[PDB]
Structures are given as structure tokens and as C-alpha cells.
Design a protein around this ligand. Structure first.
Ligand code: SF4
Length: 214
């Protein structure tokens, strides 16, 4: 494998969380790149995005050109989300990776009942998001997400750096301390791309069947 050892990863996550207490998003990404950078697509840390905007993508490309960015194409996405994905891949200096489940929508419908998302959403999410994400992250020692502590009351204590137990690696959230005004001013000052559905009155953007219509 190409993963770092579990105790090594836990100690690195602890040292990073202690050392980056109160750092800006760029400082966290700089530390991540300095730690897991070598030994441009030949990288040891990856960035994850839901294609709702290109804030974290812009930052990661500014600190590391050609950085890999994973997108979980569950086959239930909006056409606008796939269009935003393509736009970010064409514009930004980023290596995009289309993480797809091994079974298509039609295949899963025929093998486990049509529209499995409506009959059991947890298993659909596990099959099309969690399992492919884990199979892809096997190989990377750390991964970066655009999680903000304001996303939910349960996310209020989201750490800057920690050890993700679900995939057993290092998880760093640069946008954790960011507020809505923060991301708004950043998008304004940097002219970064935004999913059209966000402009069309959508709080969050996920799979088409499991997104609350306004
Ligand atoms: S959000 Fe809905 S459609 Fe998308 S993977 Fe989860 S259960 Fe399936």
C-alpha cells in the first residue's frame, strides 16, 4: 500500500491540530502540502468537493497546482452539478477524479430494486458514496474537505485537523472557522465559479432525488 502507518497518522494529525490552532485556510493547506506532498498528480493528499462552489478548490490549486480533487458521481446528480464539475476541471489547475460506484443506476435498480434511494436511503448512500469514497481514499494519507462548523449544530466542534476513523486517515477542514459572510466575500473577491442551482435558491446541493426542493 501507499498509506502511512496508523499510529504515525494519528500522531501527525495530533501534531497538526496542535500546531495549526487558529490558522487561516491557506496555512492549513500549506501544512498539508508540506507534509504529504511527495514520495504534480503524484501526490499523497487529496481534496474532496461537492461541486457547490470552487472556494476550497481555488485555495488548494493556489497552494498546489495540479492538485487532485475527487468528485463522488453517484449517477443521481443534477446536470448543473456535473456542468459545474466540468467547468472547474477546465478552468482551474486541478486534476479532477470522477469517483463512481461499480454499479450504475440501472444496474443497482435491477439488482436491488428500482429506486433504492427511496426504499432504503442509508444503504444507497453507503453503496454509492461511502464505499467508493473509501476505496478511493485507500492510498492517501490525508484528505481535505470544505466542512464548515456552521453547517449544522452537530458540526459545531468540527476540528481543524483530526484522524478520520471511518476511512482511517488524516482529515483537515480549512473552512471550518468560515462563516457565510466569509465565503461570500471570498467568492466576490476571487470570482470563483458557483453551481447555478445555488443561485436558484438551494441551500445545499446533493443527489437529485434526495435534495429538498425550495
Ligand atoms: S443522497 Fe440519496 S440518491 Fe444520493 S447516494 Fe444518498 S441515498 Fe442515494
Amino acid at each position: 500500500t501507499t498509506r502511512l502507518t496508523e499510529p504515525q497518522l494519528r500522531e501527525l494529525a495530533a501534531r497538526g491540530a496542535a500546531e495549526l490552532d487558529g490558522a487561516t485556510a491557506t496555512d492549513m493547506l500549506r501544512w498539508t502540502d508540506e507534509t504529504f506532498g511527495d514520495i504534480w498528480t503524484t501526490c499523497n493528499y487529496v481534496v474532496a468537493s461537492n461541486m457547490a462552489d470552487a472556494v476550497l478548490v481555488d485555495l488548494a490549486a493556489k497552494v498546489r497546482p495540479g492538485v487532485p480533487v475527487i468528485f463522488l458521481d453517484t449517477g443521481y446528480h443534477f446536470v448543473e452539478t456535473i456542468g459545474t464539475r466540468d467547468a472547474i476541471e477546465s478552468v482551474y489547475d486541478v486534476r479532477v477524479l470522477n469517483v463512481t460506484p461499480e454499479h450504475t443506476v440501472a444496474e443497482q435498480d435491477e439488482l436491488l430494486g428500482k429506486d433504492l434511494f427511496a426504499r432504503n436511503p442509508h444503504e444507497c448512500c453507503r453503496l454509492r458514496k461511502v464505499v467508493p469514497l473509501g476505496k478511493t481514499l485507500r492510498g492517501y494519507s490525508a484528505w481535505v474537505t470544505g466542512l464548515r462548523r456552521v453547517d449544522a449544530p452537530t458540526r459545531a466542534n468540527a476540528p481543524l485537523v483530526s484522524f478520520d476513523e471511518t476511512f482511517k486517515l488524516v482529515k483537515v477542514n480549512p473552512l471550518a472557522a468560515w462563516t457565510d459572510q466569509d465565503v461570500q466575500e471570498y467568492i466576490a473577491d476571487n470570482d470563483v465559479l458557483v453551481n447555478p442551482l445555488v443561485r436558484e435558491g438551494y441551500p445545499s446541493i446533493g443527489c437529485a432525488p434526495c435534495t429538498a426542493k425550495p
